[PDB]
């Protein structure tokens, strides 16, 4: 079973903003997670072919990854911070739903999620 098309990172029909919260989401939140030692499995869409996960996209119908989020932030895809926060949460949720407690990938997601929560706890108020 092939990979699906990746999530959209460009859509000229979609209204966009550059906001201080979205800037924080790139400069602080994404940056922190991206540089982490456990970031690598999450830096691009799950390649179900290479990774021999033929049931992945049967189970996971809203795929998300930090490669996609990074592109969405750098290319100003979002209207608001909540959209981006939802993408991160979708990414973590997918990992927990597909895998089992104590799997390496789940421990990796937990570490990244801890940092995610720490950083969005201090999301600045809108300017």
Ligand X SMILES: Cc1ccsc1CNc1cnn(C)c(=O)c1Cl
Which residues in this chain contact ligand X in the complex, by CB under 6 A?
41-42, 46, 51, 53, 95, 98-99, 104-105
Q: Buried (b) or exposed (e) across 109-119, using 16+ Cβ within 10 A?
A: beebbeebeeb
- Judged by beta carbon, residue 52 or residue 125, the one nearer ligand X is 52
The least CB distance from residue 38 to ligand X, in Å, is 9
Distance CA 34, CA 57 (A): 24
Nearer of residues 28 and 105 to ligand X, judged by Cβ: 105
**How far apart are the C-alpha atoms of 50 and 117, rounded to whole Å?**
31
Q: How far is the CB of 14 from ligand X (least distance, A)?
A: 25
Length of the chain (residues): 127
Nearer to ligand X, 73 or 95 (CB): 95
**Shortest distance in whole angstroms from residue 56 CB to ligand X:** 7
Query: Nearest-CA neighbor of 98 among 115, 86, 90?
Result: 90
């Amino acid at each position: 079973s092939m990979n699906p098309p990746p999530p959209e990172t460009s859509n000229p029909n979609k209204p966009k903003r550059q906001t201080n919260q979205l800037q924080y989401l790139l400069r602080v939140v994404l940056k922190t997670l991206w540089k982490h030692q456990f970031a690598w499995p999450f830096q691009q869409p799950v390649d179900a072919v290479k990774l021999n996960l033929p049931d992945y996209y049967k189970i996971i119908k809203t795929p998300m990854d930090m490669g996609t989020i990074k592109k969405r932030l750098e290319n100003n895809y979002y209207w608001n911070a909540q959209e981006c926060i939802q993408d991160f949460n979708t990414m973590f949720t997918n990992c927990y739903i597909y895998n089992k407690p104590g799997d390496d990938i789940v421990l990796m997601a937990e570490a990244l999620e801890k940092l995610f929560l720490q950083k969005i706890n201090e999301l600045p108020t809108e300017e």
